[PDB]
Amino acid sequence: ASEALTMIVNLLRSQRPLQEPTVEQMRAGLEAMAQMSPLPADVELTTVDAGGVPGAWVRVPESDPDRVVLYLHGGGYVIGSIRTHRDLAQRIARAARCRVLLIDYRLAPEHPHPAAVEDSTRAYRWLLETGSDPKRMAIAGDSAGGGLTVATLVALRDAGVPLPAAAVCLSPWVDLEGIGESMTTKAAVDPMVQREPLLRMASMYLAGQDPRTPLAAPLYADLRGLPPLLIQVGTAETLLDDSVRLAERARAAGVQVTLEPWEDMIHVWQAFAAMLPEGQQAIERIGEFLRQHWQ
């Protein structure tokens, strides 16, 4: 990997964003980190009420206005915001030449599961109601947002809602128990995600519900009929086996899956695309994948 990876690893080993002592310190910590990657002047941000869920349209000069990614941010279902993920949203908008709807879905512990999935499905139905066409849509998300992407597709399918052209999962979190082999074997090389913080956030999200609740932990969901899925994951991730197990389950359910393991990459390395070449390379791949499925 690029020497830039060492700089990102050094930042994450010091900032330890998922290890802050309170939820508000975790939220403020991630907002502080996001303020480092500042928004290009050509990004247009429009706040919107997306059918009862706060959102922001993210548009760049070459955004095809009829193509839309519903973007579901990461942060363990507990942290993250429009502010933390607007840079990743504009980079995807730029690579996919589309608009991105970034939603402020309800967060735990204040709003436990299934609030996040109610909000993501509501935003998708709102896009249809306001004239977006599924054949020009996609759902994408990182980490918890990658799990929420799969859960959103399952919930939409089960409600007879037409599914989008494709979906994208960046280092998805789909096993809320952390029982993947990589949760042990990659613990030493993962500078961001470990089992204890994972379980802390799963507890807040589940509020005593079965950790194998299918819309909370889509490793246990029925994935039949989902649209083509790109899963990007780093091999230096405790969550590597979340992506491997999701790919296995989705392919067993007849889903078109592209599993892309990026050698030595860390959790949601795409977020560091300003400084990390593999981050921008991976976002270009997201854009290529989406444009291919919108052809």
Side-chain angles (χ1 to χ4, degrees):
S2 64
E3 277 181 53
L5 181 63
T6 296
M7 169 174 316
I8 300 309
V9 168
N10 286 342
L11 179 65
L12 293 173
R13 287 212 184 269
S14 293
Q15 291 305 104
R16 302 170 44 73
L18 299 183
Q19 306 276 353
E20 297 286 354
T22 71
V23 167
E24 282 306 329
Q25 285 178 239
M26 280 203 285
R27 290 176 177 154
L30 189 63
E31 294 221 326
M33 294 181 64
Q35 288 163 29
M36 298 297 83
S37 206
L39 208 67
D42 64 355
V43 176
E44 284 285 311
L45 257 272
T46 312
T47 79
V48 62
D49 175 20
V53 186
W57 286 111
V58 178
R59 186 162 163 141
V60 293
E62 305 311 326
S63 290
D64 177 337
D66 293 304
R67 296 173 170 195
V68 181
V69 172
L70 169 62
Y71 195 86
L72 308 177
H73 70 76
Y77 294 107
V78 173
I79 74 174
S81 68
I82 284 168
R83 283 157 298 288
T84 60
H85 281 74
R86 64 185 161 196
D87 183 59
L88 186 50
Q90 72 86 10
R91 290 182 189 272
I92 290 169
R94 201 179 294 278
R97 298 193 281 270
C98 66
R99 296 191 288 159
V100 173
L101 181 68
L102 183 60
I103 63 163
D104 188 30
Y105 64 82
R106 277 174 292 163
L107 296 172
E110 294 85 350
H111 308 295
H113 180 79
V117 188
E118 288 175 347
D119 286 350
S120 56
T121 59
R122 186 173 293 132
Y124 185 93
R125 291 178 101 148
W126 174 81
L127 285 170
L128 296 185
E129 176 196 331
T130 60
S132 292
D133 291 329
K135 67 178 131 202
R136 284 176 278 279
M137 292 166 67
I139 307 174
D142 59 291
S143 201
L148 186 57
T149 292
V150 181
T152 300
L153 291 164
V154 170
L156 290 171
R157 185 199 66 224
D158 289 342
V161 179
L163 295 182
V168 180
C169 300
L170 306 190
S171 301
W173 185 31
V174 297
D175 165 16
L176 302 185
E177 296 185 294
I179 60 174
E181 189 177 10
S182 59
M183 192 56 53
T184 305
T185 65
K186 302 291 188 168
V189 291
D190 193 324
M192 200 188 310
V193 181
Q194 299 290 333
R195 193 169 191 257
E196 268 143 291
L198 183 156
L199 290 174
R200 174 188 182 201
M201 288 181 305
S203 164
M204 294 174 185
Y205 187 48
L206 288 165
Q209 292 169 89
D210 184 347
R212 303 188 173 202
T213 295
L215 290 179
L219 180 55
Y220 303 99
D222 189 336
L223 305 186
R224 173 109 16 211
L226 260 55
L229 184 56
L230 172 63
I231 305 166
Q232 293 187 327
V233 63
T235 70
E237 287 206 59
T238 52
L239 289 173
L240 176 56
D241 281 325
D242 283 45
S243 285
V244 171
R245 288 176 292 175
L246 175 62
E248 177 181 66
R249 184 166 192 81
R251 280 295 310 129
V255 176
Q256 191 207 123
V257 182
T258 298
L259 175 60
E260 276 186 2
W262 287 63
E263 196 166 342
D264 297 321
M265 285 306 100
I266 55 81
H267 191 59
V268 195
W269 78 94
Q270 301 92 337
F272 304 97
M275 291 175 288
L276 184 64
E278 292 93 333
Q280 194 51 49
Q281 290 160 31
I283 296 175
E284 295 300 336
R285 255 301 289 149
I286 295 168
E288 184 180 9
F289 174 85
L290 291 174
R291 283 184 284 94
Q292 167 72 21
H293 286 289
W294 289 328
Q295 286 291 128

